[PDB]
Amino acid sequence: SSAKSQLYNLCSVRHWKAPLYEYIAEGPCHMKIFTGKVTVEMKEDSRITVLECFGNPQYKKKIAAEQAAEAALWYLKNVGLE
Amino acid sequence: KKLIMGTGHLSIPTGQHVVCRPWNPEITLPQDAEMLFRDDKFIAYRLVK
Numbered sequence: 001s002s003a004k005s006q007l008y009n010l011c012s013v014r015h016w017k018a019p020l021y022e023y024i025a026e027g028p029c030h031m032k033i034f035t036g037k038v039t040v041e042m043k044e045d046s047r048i049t050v051l052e053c054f055g056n057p058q059y060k061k062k063i064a065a066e067q068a069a070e071a072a073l074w075y076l077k078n079v080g081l082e
Numbered sequence: 083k084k085l086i087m088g089t090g091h092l093s094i095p096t097g098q099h100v101v102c103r104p105w106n107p108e109i110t111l112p113q114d115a116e117m118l119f120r121d122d123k124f125i126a127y128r129l130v131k
Contacts, residue, residue: 047096048097049097049099049100050099051101052099052100054102054103054104055104056104071102071104071124075100075102075124075126078092079091079094
């Protein structure tokens with residue numbers, strides 16, 4: 001199971017907005033590296049904390065977004081969530 | 083500093099702005115960065131304003 005989908009599941013199961021993915025793109029046009037950014041809106045007892053997670057730069061957006069999700073999961077596990 | 087973890091959890095800094103990147107020993111955090119916690123694979127922090 002992919003970390004991108006696990007983060008989606010976690011987000012609905014807790015009645016959260018679905019996570020949003022953006023991308024920073026660096027380099028000349030013939031070599032673009034992508035950094036994944038995922039935003040999760042953490043709702044805890046009716047108040048919201050915004051979680052912004054990045055991964056490392058990858059050559060494929062898909063791998064870059066996966067790693068962003070994987071960072072979000074890391075943080076959410078460490079604060080006792082699933 | 084170091085803190086082995088059993089079955090504890092961490093608090094959410096409720097209502098602020100939290101950021102997590104992969105951690106690399108020669109990373110640079112921005113001015114407003116306040117490290118919350120990290121292992122040796124990721125790091126979490128927040129901003130001042």
